[PDB]
Swiss-Prot record, chain A:
PANTHER family per the UniProt record, alphabetical: 1-DEOXY-D-XYLULOSE 5-PHOSPHATE REDUCTOISOMERASE (PTHR30525), 1-DEOXY-D-XYLULOSE 5-PHOSPHATE REDUCTOISOMERASE, CHLOROPLASTIC (PTHR30525:SF0)
GO molecular function: 1-deoxy-D-xylulose-5-phosphate reductoisomerase activity; manganese ion binding; NADPH binding
Function: Catalyzes the NADPH-dependent rearrangement and reduction of 1-deoxy-D-xylulose-5-phosphate (DXP) to 2-C-methyl-D-erythritol 4-phosphate (MEP).
EC number: 1.1.1.267
Binding annotation for NADPH: 11-14, 39, 125, 127, 216
Protein name, as recorded: 1-deoxy-D-xylulose 5-phosphate reductoisomerase
Residues binding Mn(2+): 151, 153, 232
Taxonomic placement: Bacteria, Pseudomonadati, Pseudomonadota, Gammaproteobacteria, Vibrionales
Catalytic activity: 2-C-methyl-D-erythritol 4-phosphate + NADP(+) = 1-deoxy-D-xylulose 5-phosphate + NADPH + H(+)
Length: 397, 398
């Protein structure tokens, strides 16, 4: 039986990795729809190669351009435009799975639409669980959607957990399945071996120099502060329904091990592999089976040494903020994430120091939280939080 | 409900670790029988603490001694003696699981008896699969016994494999479940960083210094040559039904990782933990659930650095011999194991050099293999033949 897919966010690197897996398994997967933002040139090339039934641009003007370009290159592809069209392709009857890889706030509504339709969700959008975890888990339970996490760490944890837990995300009783705790791993960022005193002076040039990867500058800074891990922590809490006793963070500088699980008998399972997103994506497509992903086997002769260390809160005050916000709930995580988007832009623009990012997040978080949720209500909250963060940034210069 | 257990080999370290697990879970496991060889002093203390229904010594004279002690220390325990009594406790109707931890050739018959009775076998005897793999897998299939491997590496592999493979040991189709390679790990022994050239001059004193554990001198020398890993390789081939392409050996000097599995999509699963046999034993008792084992969580503060290297067959010629013998079949693995027991005794009596151990194994193996359906008895005869041939080659080497 062929798996039919909608890919939301087809022109970015997650979309490319998904398409590489599908290309390696032409008998097993079939693309019905491709959707993107306003990169028409990339989209026309993908529609030419894939000849999908539907192609959607989130931007209506971009959709008009694509429709002109496709009318002969991809003549059986119907081009659509706008937010309602993203929901439409995410909810088609013939579709089994939706790669939810549109990033930011814009991804929430279509990701939610696929959830309400009971699809298999290949979740590659952080905001769904960072802003609105409770709401998504509640809707997933209502519709019978399956949630399969795409992010490297979550996907690793998922593989290290037993099958009964894998098939019950959002709701799982970890203790009763013999899990003592999940070990969420991270690189520690470029300042992992730098003195706390030196952090005041660090520049964006220094903070973006990620030790293992070359990502967007926003996410690279989140890795320098470990806000990135804090957001992964929040997501993991909702995916695996972890109490405050059941989720830990460890620094693993080399990022070969992607995360681990500690079982009750003393046994630890760990997931490792080459740093290629096709591996985890492949699992989310194929679960409970496995398929070729175009990724080579890990070469242990070249892996080097693996080490571990303990983060501290002097160095990574953002990680404390995120864990705290995590157990305060959606209002708090929404606020923190919004504050941090603004604080990080402010550091990239040289308006504030590196150590002010956490100060901004701390102020905004305190104000909002001192003084029924919906996607709309949480977006309003995001706006409010952004305004407060704008105000604190002004003061810090 | 309650799992009822017979423990074959209760007085060694595997038996102690099993009993530590059972002690942590008094509502889940129950000891019906304890069996041992001729360590009466330890047995009588264990029977005093556990008050089992049966206590068996393999040696009949030892069983008489135990009966007299238990007249005072465990008056409701029935003591029995001899090989037939081991089979008797291994096949009791009320028993669900049998810890098969009697070592050597002596363990084969009782282990086989529990297999024929359809029990859950917690397999901690290397000879069952090293000497007679085919025969055990065939009997397990016929009776409906479950085989759960106790040894650290095999247990780790088991935990890193998918559930459909876990429930089909002996007969599994690895390729179809997405498994590319099983990665059997080992410390490399005390000569892992020593030049090939210097191995001629090695002393028993040097070879018994295993860098992570402290053990019997035979097994310590098997780690120095990696014959120990070779034997684990052979066992793994029968447990997981693995071709030579599907089974690789990696040296991992720190032995925190206990083995790994490489999947088709690029994903690797690894099992790690504190070095305590209670962990794997616990899983063999509790599968598919998990129980407390009296083992702490792994402390990543104390792990140090984890490294990996490819073994050099120039350095570990016994490992190459074992992998070769593995795909030649029961005759070749039986022969190798016998030759190696003799060669190692010869090195531990200073009759031969460390590098001769492999030369002895190589000669015997070649001689035997240039030449009804196999049986435990037939394979034991072959073991004897092999021992005689190895005796001769030892005489020839100095």
């Amino acid at each position: 039986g062929m798996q039919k897919l909608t890919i939301l966010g087809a022109t970015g690197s997650i979309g490319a990795s998904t398409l590489k897996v599908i290309e390696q398994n032409p008998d097993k997967f079939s693309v019905v729809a491709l959707a993107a933002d306003s990169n028409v040139e990339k989209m026309q090339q993908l529609c030419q190669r894939w000849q999908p039934e539907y192609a959607v641009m989130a931007n209506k003007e971009a959709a008009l351009r694509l429709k002109m370009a496709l009318a002969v290159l991809a003549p059986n592809t119907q081009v659509l435009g706008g937010q309602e069209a993203l929901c439409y392709v995410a909810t088609l009857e013939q579709v089994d799975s939706v790669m939810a890889a549109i990033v930011g706030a814009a991804g929430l509504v279509p990701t939610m639409a696929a959830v309400k339709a009971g699809k298999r969700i290949l979740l590659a959008n952080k905001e769904a669980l960072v802003m609105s975890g409770q709401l998504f888990i509640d809707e997933v339970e209502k519709s019978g959607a399956q949630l399969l996490p795409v992010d490297s760490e979550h996907n690793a944890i998922f593989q290290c957990l037993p099958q009964t837990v894998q098939g019950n995300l959002g709701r799982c009783d970890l203790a009763s399945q013999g899990v003592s705790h999940i070990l969420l791993t991270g690189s520690g960022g470029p300042f992992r071996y730098t003195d706390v005193a030196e952090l005041e002076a660090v520049t964006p040039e220094q903070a973006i120099a990620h030790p293992n990867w070359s990502m967007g500058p926003k996410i690279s800074v989140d890795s320098a502060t470990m806000m990135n891990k804090g957001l992964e922590y929040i997501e993991a809490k909702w995916l695996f329904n972890a109490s405050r006793d059941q989720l830990k963070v460890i620094i693993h500088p080399q990022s070969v091990i992607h995360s681990m699980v500690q079982y009750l008998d003393g046994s630890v399972l760990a997931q490792m592999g080459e740093p290629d997103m096709a591996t985890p994506i492949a699992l989310t497509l194929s679960y409970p089976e496995r398929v070729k992903a175009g990724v080579k086997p890990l070469d242990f002769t070249q892996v080097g040494e693996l080490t571990f260390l303990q983060p501290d809160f002097e160095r990574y005050p953002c990680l404390a903020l995120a864990i705290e916000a995590c157990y305060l709930g959606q209002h708090a995580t929404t606020t923190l994430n919004a504050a941090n988007e603004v604080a990080v832009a402010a550091f990239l623009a040289r308006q504030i120091k590196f150590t002010d990012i956490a100060r901004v997040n701390d102020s905004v978080l305190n104000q909002v939280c001192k003084q029924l949720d919906s996607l709309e209500s949480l977006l309003e909250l995001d706006r409010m939080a952004r305004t407060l963060a704008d105000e604190v940034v002004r003061e810090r210069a």
